[model samples]
Target chain A: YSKILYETLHGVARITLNRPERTNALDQEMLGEINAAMDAAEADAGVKAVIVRGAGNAFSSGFDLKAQMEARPAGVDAWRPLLRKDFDTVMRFWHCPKPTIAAVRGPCLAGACELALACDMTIATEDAFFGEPELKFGAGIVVMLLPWIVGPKIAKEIILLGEDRVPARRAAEIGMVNRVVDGDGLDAEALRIARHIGAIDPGLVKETKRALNRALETQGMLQALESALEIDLAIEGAGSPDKIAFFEVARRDGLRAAIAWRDARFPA
Target chain B: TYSKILYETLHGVARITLNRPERTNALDQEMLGEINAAMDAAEADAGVKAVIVRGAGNAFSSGFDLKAQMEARPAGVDAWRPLLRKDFDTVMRFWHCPKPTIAAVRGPCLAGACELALACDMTIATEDAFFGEPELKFGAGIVVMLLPWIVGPKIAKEIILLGEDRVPARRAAEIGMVNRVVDGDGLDAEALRIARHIGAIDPGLVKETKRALNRALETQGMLQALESALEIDLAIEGAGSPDKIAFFEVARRDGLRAAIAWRDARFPA
Candidate 1:
């Protein structure tokens, strides 16, 4: 991968988003690279733990709105495959046999936030922030995992309010981030935790990870996520008025201009 | 005149105490039966608005009474079936109970007893309390697989798969295993206060709200998970582990301490 960096050392595999200039935003190519990187990590016996991070200050700004504006994916048939790809990529992190950790800093918003949440654990820098700002931009949730992780009250507050400024400490309080550390040492901290997990017997760790997931899987979590994804597909395919107008601005005047239009509608 | 459990009602609250302090209120089959009777009595009386369970001694309960098991010397699925069903009923009935059921857990709520606490709608733990599912350690299967439903998968597996028996009360609360953690000696009072608060609510509203809450989980597959978990438990029973038999052999011959010591030596944890 051109879009991402994958390396293994000391029983840990690191998958870093390399597009710092783009704020490491996940485009179609980056998402595919992530899935491929995950495949390599999963296939290798040397990799007992996997860590996902970014190249620079920010983790990701989520799915590439500019790419969508360029591709002009139309109707349910066109959007279905793309959405499925995105959903699968996120769930892969969650359903991986080995433990996965997200070492997040700066903006971990929207789909990127979901990807991090899908990981078995998340350690964030104190400056890192999280949220599902999709609802604000006329997009629906793809994962619907926040409800399961943080329970109904907080999930509703975050998603319903389109809260994109959730601080790392607040995320930890809500059980999203396992630990919060300073930005400078965030990489070292995440690697330390991943290696610690790697030292545990792989057989024990894998089965234990399975048992943990079975709790949610048994309660129709997979079914719920699938349904939520379908709902998202419908929302996108229909191309709601807000989404159309938002994209029209993006296609005409770049993403930042469109983002400004969306943000200006709501109070700070 | 219950021999194993003490039952009483006050201020629209029914209090059920596991009276065998000498055994850390370790529940035996007889005690489970007494508990059922007490639950029935409380549910029938309109005056009894809520029910709370606690242990008389330092611990909430040391879990299932190993003494009774050692004496019975029972083996095989045929012998265990009825016993497991009875055990499951007495434990899960807390959640099924129409009235708000609360557990005032103090210490060492382990194995079946730990499941019992999880079964309750609310559990208030003292700071000194701990919880675990040590079934796998002794070569037994889980009686109630409710831990997964209550806590996150990582935490659940850490306790169940590892036989982690010393999950501190604050940790338990942090993982949503228990509803809240209070300081020592405040466990009973907190439980009672919560129960009384429930009692003050319109009984119909309380029952309906709990029913809806329970339905959300059941609909989402909690009930199915537990049933599947029980199926796995039955399989574990049918296919006996030599280690399990050996574990009991040591317990029956040597004392419980020696048996656990031997068990520790094998696991080397």
Candidate 2:
């Protein structure tokens, strides 16, 4: 795949996010590649477990910035389908019958953070951090898995505060990360976990994971997820003032400049 | 005077301690009745800002008194309805309480008692404490099925299906099951500090914010999920299981220790 590296060895399927230059940011193309990779992994009888990571270092910087294709009035019609695609790509990890693991090194922010939370297990390096910075850009959260993993209080605080510097240890403490190891050992640790899960009877693992997910569904996990994703789409379509200003600034200068432009107004 | 529980209100915090520590704070009909009354009293008293629920001894609770159930031998849902419903409502009282309820737990909190701790808004557990739901092993089903909502799906299945009774506090905190874990010495102290902190907040803000937080989950079908699971539990208990029958038989013939031994013999973990 152009935007992802997909390979299987010893029953472990590795789908590495491939845009190192973009810090593995998930643009439309990358998301398409990732979805197809997940499809292949789940269909392969030889693949018992799947591990997702980034090629260079960082997990992902979340959705990549790009130009819009629709007018303000038509935004909802255009954005809904696109956002739904984005939502499905990340959630495929959750619905996959094969055990899904997120192997992280550096920044796992915003939508990328939710992707990790979607996985059955997430193991991170000491250098890895997690957060939702969308609200700062006046964007809404794409997935609402935070409250499912952690509790509502922590989830609200992280999203509302736009907390982006959450260390891997703190993430583990809050039930986000299954484990956190030293940075250099990330690959070995992640592989070890994947192998352990892979060696288990695939059917048992699949059924157990199914049982686990169904319990959450019984509590309306899917409804909550849809509502949250829907809210984000509407927010993007409606285009809040803060969102418009930040993107407008980015459109003129660049992302970093736009970030600086917005930061100045907030004053810490 | 309450026979099975200690109730006191001090400095805007009402404390309800399951006084039957000798029984690992097992909730018999008497204890459940007492807790229900204490909860009503705490909610009625405007002076009480927050509530603390804990056990008198090292353990939180061993859950509903198996010994009582063994003798009562309520046949089917007809006989079990009043008893189980009362137990269910009593456990949920903490969750529905207007005041912020804290379960200051230490040592064992299993089955129905574990559900009690889960129902609390927040739990401050001692590092030595452990939690689990061992229903299926005894031929019973889950009481509340709140584990999935609290600790997510996988862990809940592992704990409940496997009948794990010794999930440690550190791991519990890691999984968001326990809000915080402290040394045994500081269990009550930390609980007080947190309660006082809440007490110090504007009552209206604290209450309303809590409502908003709960609404997030309730709107997502938490209430329906819990209620549905309760019905499944009734079905399981009403039909009864071989293990459940064998369990009480051994207990009545010998003792609870022997019955527990008989129960685990099949699994052999």
Candidate 3:
């Protein structure tokens, strides 16, 4: 089955990530599919707006760690190919001549959060959560868009901790997301938001989004990603097998049991 | 305990101390009155060239008194009424006060303490002094209303969201929060040295220069930005959750002590 499904009608192109079995998880090939989808959407003259969503319950559960472990590619060697492709697609949201909206309804982790942040606007459901839990998997962070969207401290907490969750409501309160809706209404709500933007002058929407993004890009964050890009996979080298095994047990064990295991290791 | 916020002058230098250090120098209605009175004293007195405002103990005012908030709550009405206090008058007084006001900060200058420092012409903080706003921990919004103007919205949101008071003095200075930082032993001395320098400058000229600078900043949309802060606060105030309700109760039941502790430790704090 295809990893992503796209449909264009009227003035909007809706892209759905089609890996529900994997929690819409991000893999190397999946990144290429998203990139291709974005390129197609941008090239279409009828597409004045884009709405990106993930299929099934989750928006994304972050990276496909299972696939990574199986491949076991040497430190950071595998990251460049994937990361460059990912950025090529993600950054298009900034440069594309159409307004883009990210409709998030569930857990968005690691690179997935980076993708949502790159969009012109974000609409989330109450159950939506955005976080960077890569530190837990011995993976380095690859995005530098935090301070530009949320502030230095919130950004710091998400990056330094392995499992920090920024609830959709709180993210909305802090101006990270444009709006938040109930869990069940996420897709319709996102489409509604996109329609509103699409109704506006498409050129104005694109120009204004570009100007605003340029202001944030001027703050040195865009360049910081280069350093983050270089060190992305190397962070995995620091992850001990014990840590991986500990997480594996937690995933299999109930949350309480997982807490017990972590408590034993860290020792309150 | 509210420090009577009295003024003293050994020489030409005027000193205003928030004296009730027993309660970690927390503010009460009486203390607010006293601070305004002290501001009046410095503004009116010709002999007082420059003024210094400082707390008497290891901590600056620990924000508004919870006891008063609980007592002041109108029955059936939300006890969070005091949460509406804009503290704009005090800031207005500071921003408009003719004399140079210096905050000699030591130890914990949490919440309102940070607001007070930001209002002054300059701030002198000691090496061990720390600053923060733990308002978010209580789910009670800050009434200072000048946060966005003091630091940009980005920094202000971080301070409110993290809800902590543990940023060290040097970083505070680096962020434009404080004018200078000195060792604990030299805090008073350092404040005095700066105070003396201002004292020797032409008083009328200094006041005019200060006024010009204030006008320049104010013209840069400071007031417009403050209006935006209140509008945001009102939107946040429309919440109706038991967790949010309980958060306000803690603010009324136990002023900011619990919140400050949380902010100091970093997570809830």
Q: Largest TM-score belongs to which candidate?
A: 1
Clashes of 3: 6
For candidate 1, lDDT tens digit of each residue in A1-268?
Answer: 8989999988899999889888888899999899899899999999988999988799998988778888988899999999999899999988999888899999999999999888888889989999999988888887888887777899999998889999999997777887789889998887776765664445546654665577688777888899999998999889878888898888888888999999998986
Model 3: runs farther than 4 Å from truth? A233-268, B1-269
Clashing pairs in 2: B107-B129
Clashes of each: 0, 1, 6
State in Å the error of residue B95, model 3: 29
Model 2 alpha-carbon miss at residue A4, Å: 1.1
- Which residue runs does candidate 1 get wrong by more than 4 Å? A7-14, A43-49, A181-219, A238-258, B1-14, B18-49, B62-87, B131-143, B151-183, B190-216, B233-269
Q: Each candidate's root-mean-square deviation in Å?
A: 5.0, 7.7, 19.1
**lDDT tens per residue, model 1, B90-109:** 99889999888999988889
- What TM-score would you give candidate 1 relative to the actual structure? 0.76
Q: List each candidate's DockQ score.
A: 0.17, 0.10, 0.01
Task: Give the better candidate number (1 or 3) by DockQ.
Answer: 1
Best by DockQ: 1
Lowest summed lDDT window (length 10), candidate 1 chain A: A199-208
lDDT per residue, candidate 2, A27-145, as tens digits?
A: 88898899888888888999988899987889998887653311332468877887898789889988999878899989999889989989888888989999998888878888888
Worst 10 residues of 1 chain B by lDDT: B153-162
The local distance difference test score of model 1 is 0.84
